[PDB]
Amino acid sequence: PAPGPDSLLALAFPSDPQVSPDGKQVAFVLAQISEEPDKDFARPRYRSGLWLSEGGAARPLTHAETGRGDSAPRWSPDGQNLAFVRSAVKAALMLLPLKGGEARRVTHFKNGVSGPQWSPDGRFIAFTTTADTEDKRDERGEARVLTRPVYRANGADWLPERPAALWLYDVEADKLREWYAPEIGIGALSWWPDSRGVLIVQSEDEWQASQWRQDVYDLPLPTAPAAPQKLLDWNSAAHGLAPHPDGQRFALIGRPAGKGNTEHAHLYLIENGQHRRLDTGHDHPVGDAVGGDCHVGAFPEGPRWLDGDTLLFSSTVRGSVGLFTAHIGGGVKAYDHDPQGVISAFTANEHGVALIRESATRFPEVELNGQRVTDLHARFPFPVREPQRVTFETELGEGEGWVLLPEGEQKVPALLNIHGGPHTDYGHGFTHEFQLMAARGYGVCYSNPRGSVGYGQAWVDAIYGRWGTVDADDLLNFFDRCLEAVPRLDAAKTAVMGGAYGGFMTNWITGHTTRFQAAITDRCISNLISFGGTSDIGLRFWDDELGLDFSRRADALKLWDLSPLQYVENVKTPTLIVHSVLDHRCPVEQAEQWYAALHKHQVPVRFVRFPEENHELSRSGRPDRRLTRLNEYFAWLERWL
Template identity: 30%
Template structure:
């Protein structure tokens, strides 16, 4: 697989299934180099034996939701100004009808139980900002007054456009089209939409989630109030009435809520984690399934051993049972949880379940595997069958299947990971890859980062050391306030173990690279081990001292992971040991990265240059922390080009 082949990486989004289980709808997305953006449409597949077919032809259609009678699909589509708007289309396909035209764009959507209305969330900018006045750009906006501990977010920017809740009548999909009005002096701002939405909330509080109560009278959502003086990750669950916007509190505990869902019988469930009485204990959070009852939340899954916290994890219902996805050892499996807390596996194996839906005993799931970035699978009667073949194009690129290993560390602790090796006898130069997080993990899906390096002639070693997700909370919390200790030992011990066991791996020719926490760990490695011919430090958490005042998670992340005592922080800081680095280092970063801000890179790079260490820095304009996963496709290819060029200089692959 080569860098331009990222165009073959087709993602299958969270599916929707008709109430009678007769068909499913899902969205695909893939990078397109010509368009220089992610592109995708909605697809329909009739169950159980149909072939998938496109039902929309937008540039980037996503987030399909089927009406309760299965006749209509609501979804999001970007308008001419790249703002996500709400559309509806007949479930069999046709010309979509635009429902909203909001300056801040739509973020969430949900059908009312009777199918007559749609609830959605949308960012509401202050008048005069974010293009609300034609011809007035950001440089002409008034200053922003900031009084809270949070003011920006990666991938968004400033937080001065809170997400508000709306409802709108669902328009018929077969009505006569609406037509753009001619210019008029008395109404120059008239919008062209099928219906005018009603705004239910207002003010500085933002809202997350739009779940209807079973009777259709309220929306359940999580308010987000920016704190005045200290970060608090505890959430409240609030019901907002459809008629009038009155609010009542449903849940207020020491929980951080990531998903809210209402069962057909009206029972309320959340995915949430306990953040303690101080409201900031988020390290290896232990996201679990809770039933929200009159006495309070009742935990249904064991947070110590079952991890429901993967990005995109959600809830679906099969009768009285709840389906959720659990990350474990680089996999994501689909679980069934009864209301009594009994847990069984619905779909597992060497795959990652990224989304699911269920009706009439049929489960559809979007999955990734070692041979495909995304497929739709049908589970029925205990058997699983793949309905799509989007991975065919990537398989034609001769992808290599990584080999799984478990290596005992120096203290006997088992370290789990993989090795991907080019075809042939070698010996091949070896690149040690380190993932971000820390509470994240490498998985079994096709990974372009690894495949491109293997194609260029490198063996790639990567593992999930202590601190990673998917091995229980104790594994994840073991590096809290001692980063660069157990995690460093595990990364190096796994590397040494697999290199020693495989004569195809040339341990004398090695490089190291990683992003985010992986950038932290790469910088830590080259300060303490000088065997590597070169290093790539990408979007790294490099200076914990500067992090609190610059990162969008600076108000709690560093304090929880490295502590607040200056000596303790310095003992875990790559900047504190940068003077020990002699390895040639490429520093990669993005201009709009607010998670690990650009100054983390520039301070580190400046220190390397000042002490005479060979170093270069590459900064990508307009990109944020998600460059390698969701950046402009051309930037992603240019990054790969820079990575391979760096290795060709400092770690050439012979032949």
């Protein structure tokens, strides 16, 4: 039978695959969908528990029936205990003995904790928390007085006055004490291998934080709390700190100063305040930047030293994500890279590796030392189909995309889907939305135009400062090639759709051609000037992507020329607008302007407005609103195609 959006409710979502210190076990998180019963309103919700495997079919460790559930499993160095975080009780640090018995609660903070990390010697558990700080401004209806340049963040909503402090659990003493209360905030954190302290990333002040300039600090264990020592004058973006086994050097993931957001994230070896590129000769970014919609929870990608010379890391290459090794004394060698697959998360040590793997046709699964330990693809409720590759030509070389077809041979509408970013990739991630589209009779066309991230730095740079030129050209070129190479696609029943940057591009295309019969613009951008003033990254995004400062009079003129709203008078395509109220990455005023403009021109238009959700709705929103979004997608395509 034909599937619908609620096929999602059959799925269980894996995350956070943590290999044991001896390399022979994996503990991971599994989110299943269960009731929050209200007789008048169904309430399907994510509920997570911990699972364990030593090579065979994984078994459950916890059984949450209320709340969000359990997450962030962390092995004690001796391999006998699992720390984790429970919300059933707001996010408390818990301690589970693996040889029998239930967990013990360790923290009772009003605001909960996050990001637990054992020290390598097993004597401490580090975590961050706002402890019992009270803020009844919203509860009382008081005003919020804002003086900092950034005050909201997507997913976190309003940033607190005092940032979360780093805390310490003394395992032997069974005692908690505050370690370091920063004034700005803590980014990446990693223990030194000798457990003497941690390395942390933080910014000098609130302005420098808004400009994506951070430094690395050394924080020894407290005696009074500890004072961070400056360790590297980086003045740029840094995360995923990876201390070397020698206890003195460390690797950094990021980009050096002067290079904006558009440069590939790379690996850098730090020695006495000096930095050198570590993944040299590898023209691809560190980490997973391939699209997919079956990722709920944390997906660790921190690089790990397999010995004194070898650093294991993941990298995005042409729509795929593989594991690679970087070497102090040499170049980059493949470790576990399938050009048709995506490794979305991994942990490792000198004894073993655990990861999550997926493809365009295979639902995410957990692996332990090459052995699959889950059977989650078996729960996928309808048959998956294999995409077919379609290429196009550009002055920079051959680009590629794919078409996913339904069963049968009759004519089907062709849906041009545009991925966001713009510096991400379509390809070999698993996309429930795409498989659902094909199962309901649509041909899905999706590609990696110039500006995508997996085809070298030059492919990224091609769109710098001129969004809506060669990137829109590649997309319509690709789509023309799909109609030519796939005769069952119906060129008279076409639609264009995309999210975020894909929404910007959906708005741009419909304002420059009437060829499409329907359009769906999701968490879109329509006015680049207003975006600079309202978005949580507005103070720096256009500066790095376009070289434009919205508050500078000369630049604003070009920003308007790059704004889809300038050309809205040409739009004739019936458009569905999907947006969330708490999306601080692309604020909803972007969608409201497009909606009002189409109304002024009497263009058929429909606007579905989600409360409480943020930018991440389509990948990890509450189950019922993920269903509603897909329902609105298909209702619009059924009406116009």
